[PDB]
Design a protein around this ligand. Structure first.
Ligand SMILES: Nc1ncnc2c1ncn2[C@@H]1O[C@H](COP(=O)(O)OP(=O)(O)OP(=O)(O)O)[C@@H](O)[C@H]1O
Ligand SMILES: Nc1ncnc2c1ncn2[C@@H]1O[C@H](COP(=O)(O)OP(=O)(O)OP(=O)(O)O)[C@@H](O)[C@H]1O
Ligand SMILES: [Mg+2]
Ligand SMILES: [Mg+2]
Lengths: 51, 188, 392, 257, 101
């Protein structure tokens, strides 16, 4: 943590509901999906889980 | 939410073909004329207005969609101004030397606006240059599906055939089942 | 071949390489005449042919174990049954150190050469092969410490005349103890910049190995390598690492660390009487060091490092911002020269942060606002202190 | 066809370098570069094969049925274990997981491909000792219709250097021939320990065995429909290189009930 | 006829002893190359008149004639232990598209 050494301290906070929706969408483009799946509703149900 | 965007609008060509048939009812033809004139006014189908007025309709009726030069110039000037703005964005990204994802996205923006007005050749050039990057296979699938949709828009089936065989050739380099179902619907 | 003076064109220069060619051709003529006079049937280059045919092919590789009754030896190849190989005349009987890599003949297996190691699979990383960068100019202030380190480590090597005339052996070792982030490592980089000696760096963590045996083994190897490549400026850094930490990967625990420290405290002084091996250690916590290491006669001149003062702070600001694309709006006088406590590391850290921020905006010039923002950024990212409350 | 006399040395083909040369590893221990006989069906020179070699020349002269060199044999009927799914009480979730990760992928890969999921190619039944880790697999072998090559961990290691990776490759080749098949390397914690001593011959051979196992498992393409199962009592004493996608991913967690 | 002559001559060539796979750990000189032959030890081999010593690079697999170890060929695979470490680790590939949020 001393300055001069390792420089940038970057935060990865646990994903928010929008971030969770984006991650679910990204990983959901790998399987046959029925039309009109409300992924935003599923992510909104998914609380605490991350990545 | 993600969307490939309703560009080009399929209903434009749908009602254009509905108009160009004497077999269909006159009332439905006039409804199609009203819709197509409204969409030409709103979404700036100036090049498609010129094409529809000079070919298609009068190629084979045709009073409702009358080739007005003034309306062909005002909307064309607006379209050229928008194209100039997009060129400014592309050149400013090149000057800033941003990430190649961003320059590829700017190329997609130029091409999708070119499709948004109906010019097939320049849109094809923009998306062909856009493919030259090393973007992810999903973006390439979406782009060449956009040229396939353009081919559907102008009712040139061989254009769609070559676009979709190009899709199938490289679809094995992807695998995303949603992007394969899109191609399945297009091929069907 | 010698060096050539002067650099530019000059007739005397041409005369110099004319002498070079004259002497070279004269050596060539002498060698030609001497060879021609010699009986070629046992001279000239037929010796090469005889050596090749006696050597045989392929030459296997083994390990020497003894030199009993010279013209005889006991090699030990990894697979062969440890033959009683005889030593031939071609090999040099001075490089046959027990444990070398000899070249056995294929069939009769008689030593026909010693294969020097020349590997250095681990030392190559250690051996300083390119001067880092900073010269002594880059260090702002610290004049007394620079003078002491010079007269302790540089002058004995470059200019031994003063010491031999004065009649004092040079001070053996120097330990750079002080507050963290105050140039204890920069000064080592500087002394490594101008050097006529090998500079084998090592960090105290690497002496805390995992196996029981390879605690003193590493130190013995390091100091042997320093000895053979004399002179050496070995730079054991973070020497306090052996004391604290207490790593789980260490199988021995405290006892193995104690044995390693004992081997270090021996190899520094030794019964072996090593030659020109200068030792420069540097640590943040001089307190947690067994006084056997820091005893005089092992490391004599214990140089103290202290946080810079206001003038030293402004000098550091000047040297570090010398290579700045600075706009005139930035004023160095009130920049960081504020007397509200800094360090030798903060001044460079805020410069780096401000440069990064200016890069983010793509502004090729540096703004005073960016410098101030990096200043406060460095200020918040700072564990302030603990002992000041006693005297506050 | 005279070099094909009947003293011969079994070798393992490794890499086809040219049309008439190859790199074989004779059972004696050391690799060679040899000339292939111009009569063999060169389409059969698959890697890790069981080709034969001439005695003093090592020239490749005959390819063997790849199910011949195997020291480990497919479990037939004399060794068919006598437990049933009904006999294994409880472990309902474990039973379902092993059925959906072992039996169903063997039977119906087309469903896995169509759905879009990645078919598992390795399971790591683990838990406290005495939980049915061995018995669930034992019951699987009593109902499976696929080959059930059963190796026993420490059986891989032998005094003869090179009898390791060789027999690992041989076992995997046998599994690939009789596809579908299930390998049941048992007590793998004796082969895939974390800590490693790069000075003694004991660890430097288990290392080669583990490397060969890892390379062969990575060589699993989407086809060949062969699943690998291993059980252990101590999951912590396991090389993390065995816990990556493409390798063992599904992890069953047999709990002390 | 060329095919027939080759087939007839093949019988003699098979009885010629094979060649060990070599490993060029270090280049010694212009006519001697240190080679570690698996799995026993290393040797100082002689390069043939075809292969150039400067062409050889460390970790290049090679072939040595079994009668008397003599360089006669250069392989292609090499060793490169780095792609062994990243193969054992098996880090999955990714792009900026995969990461979201
Ligand atoms: N007087 C100075 N002149 C120039 N630069 C300095 C000075 N003092 C400190 N620095 C800068 O501080 C930076 C970080 O400090 P440095 O690494 O030298 O400290 P250290 O106390 O030896 O390190 P550590 O506490 O991490 O073992 C160096 O890169 C150097 O450029
Ligand atoms: N679900 C179960 N129902 C009945 N008996 C069981 C069950 N699970 C284990 N057992 C008992 O376990 C014994 C067999 O050992 P088991 O297969 O359970 O060992 P394990 O947990 O795989 O051991 P290890 O880790 O040492 O290989 C039998 O005596 C059997 O009665
Ligand atoms: Mg330091
Ligand atoms: Mg058991």
């Amino acid at each position: 943590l001393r300055p001069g050494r390792i420089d940038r301290k970057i935060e990865f906070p646990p994903p928010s509901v929008a971030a969770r929706a984006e991650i679910l969408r990204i990983h959901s483009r790998k399987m046959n999906l029925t039309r009109g799946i409300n992924l935003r509703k599923v992510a909104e149900k998914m609380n605490g889980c991350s990545g | 939410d993600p969307t490939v965007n309703r560009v080009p609008n399929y209903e434009v060509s749908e009602k254009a073909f509905l108009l160009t048939q004497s077999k269909v009812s006159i009332e439905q033809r006039k409804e199609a004329a009203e819709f197509v004139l409204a969409k030409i006014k709103e979404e700036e189908m100036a090049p498609y207005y010129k094409y529809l007025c000079e070919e298609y309709l009068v190629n084979n009726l045709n009073e409702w969609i009358k080739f007005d030069q003034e309306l062909y110039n005002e909307l064309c000037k607006k379209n050229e101004s928008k194209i100039k703005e997009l060129n400014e964005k592309i050149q400013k990204l090149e000057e800033d030397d941003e990430g190649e994802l961003e320059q590829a996205q700017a190329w997609i923006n130029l091409g999708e606006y070119y499709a948004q007005i109906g010019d097939k050749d320049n849109a094809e050039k923009t998306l062909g240059k856009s493919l030259s990057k090393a973007i992810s296979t999903g973006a390439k699938i979406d782009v060449m599906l956009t040229i396939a949709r353009l081919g559907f828009f102008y009712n040139d089936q061989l254009y769609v055939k070559e676009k979709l065989e190009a899709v199938n050739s490289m679809i094995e380099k992807g695998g995303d089942w949603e992007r394969r179902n899109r191609y399945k619907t297009y091929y069907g | 071949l010698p060096n050539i003076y002067p650099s530019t064109r000059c007739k005397l220069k041409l005369l110099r390489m004319e002498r070079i060619k004259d002497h070279l051709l004269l050596e060539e003529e002498f060698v030609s005449n001497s060879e021609i006079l010699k009986p070629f049937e046992k001279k000239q280059e037929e010796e090469k042919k005889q050596l090749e045919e006696i050597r045989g092919n392929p030459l296997s590789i083994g390990t020497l174990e003894e030199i009993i009754d010279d013209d005889h030896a006991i090699v030990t190849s990894p697979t062969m049954p440890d033959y009683y190989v005889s030593i031939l005349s071609f090999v040099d009987k001075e490089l046959l150190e027990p444990g070398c890599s000899v070249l056995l003949h294929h069939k009769t297996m008689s030593i026909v050469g010693v294969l020097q190691d020349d590997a250095d699979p681990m030392v190559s990383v250690m051996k300083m092969d390119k001067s880092p960068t900073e010269s002594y100019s880059d260090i702002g202030g610290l004049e007394s410490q620079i003078q002491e380190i010079k007269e302790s480590v540089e002058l004995p090597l470059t200019h031994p005349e003063l010491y031999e005339e004065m009649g004092i052996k040079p001070p053996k070792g120097v330990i750079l103890y002080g507050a963290p982030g105050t140039g204890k490592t920069l000064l080592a980089k500087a002394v490594a910049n101008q050097t006529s000696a090998t500079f084998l760096r090592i960090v105290g963590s690497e002496l805390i190995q995992k196996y029981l045996g390879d605690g003193p083994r590493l130190c013995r190897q390091i100091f042997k390598v320093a000895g053979e490549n004399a002179p050496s400026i070995v730079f054991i850094d973070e020497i306090d690492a052996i004391g604290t930490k207490r790593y789980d990967s260490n199988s021995g625990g405290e006892r193995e660390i104690q044995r390693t420290m004992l081997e270090l405290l021996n190899q520094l002084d030794g019964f072996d009487d090593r030659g020109d091996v200068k030792v420069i250690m540097a640590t943040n916590k001089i307190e947690t060091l067994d006084p056997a290491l820091i005893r005089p006669g092992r490391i004599d001149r214990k140089i103290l490092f202290e946080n810079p003062d206001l003038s030293t702070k402004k000098k550091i600001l000047g040297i570090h911002t010398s290579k700045m694309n600075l706009s005139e709006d930035v004023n160095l006088e009130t920049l960081v020269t504020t007397k509200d406590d800094l360090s030798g590391a903060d001044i460079q850290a805020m410069c780096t942060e401000a440069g990064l921020l200016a890069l983010r905006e793509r502004r090729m010039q540096v703004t005073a606002e960016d410098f101030k923002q990096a200043k406060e950024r460095v200020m918040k990212n700072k564990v302030e202190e603990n002992l000041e409350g006693l005297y506050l | 066809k005279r070099i094909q006399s009947v003293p011969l040395v079994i070798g393992q083909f490794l890499e086809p370098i040219d049309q008439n040369t190859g790199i074989v590893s004779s059972t004696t221990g050391m690799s060679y570069v040899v000339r292939i006989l111009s009569t063999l069906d060169r389409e059969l020179l698959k890697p890790s094969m069981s080709v034969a070699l001439h005695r003093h020349s090592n020239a490749l002269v005959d390819i063997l049925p790849p199910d011949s060199d195997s020291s480990i044999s497919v479990m037939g009927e004399n060794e068919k274990p006598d437990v049933t799914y009904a006999d294994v009480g409880g472990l309902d979730m474990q039973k379902q997981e092993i059925r959906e990760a072992v039996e169903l992928p063997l039977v119906q890969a087309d469903l896995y491909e169509q759905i879009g999921i990645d078919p598992p190619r390795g399971v790591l039944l683990y838990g406290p000792p005495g939980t049915g880790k061995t018995m669930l697999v034992k019951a699987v072998a009593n109902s499976t219709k696929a080959a059930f090559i059963r190796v026993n961990g420490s059986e891989f290691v032998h005094k003869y250097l090179g009898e390791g990776p060789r027999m690992v490759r041989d076992v995997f080749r046998l599994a690939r021939e009789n596809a579908p098949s299930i390998i049941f390397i048992d007590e793998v914690d004796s082969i895939a320990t974390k800590r490693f001593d790069a000075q003694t011959g004991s660890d430097r051979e288990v290392q080669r065995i583990l490397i060969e196992l890892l390379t062969q498992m990575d060589g699993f393409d989407q086809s060949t429909n062969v699943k690998v199962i291993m059980a252990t009592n101590r999951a912590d004493t396991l090389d993390p290189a065995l816990l990556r996608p493409g390798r063992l991913d599904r992890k069953i967690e047999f709990p002390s009930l | 006829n060329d095919k027939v002559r080759f087939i007839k001559d093949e019988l003699r060539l098979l009885q010629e002893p094979g060649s060990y796979v070599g490993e060029v750990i270090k280049i010694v000189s212009d006519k001697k190359v240190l080679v570690k032959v698996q799995p026993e030890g290393k040797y100082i081999v002689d390069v043939a008149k075809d292969i150039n010593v400067k062409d050889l690079k460390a970790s290049q697999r090679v072939c040595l004639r079994s009668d008397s170890y003599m360089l006669h060929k250069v392989l292609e695979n090499k060793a490169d232990p780095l792609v062994s470490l990243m193969m054992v680790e098996k880090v999955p590939d990714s792009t900026y598209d995969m990461v979201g949020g």
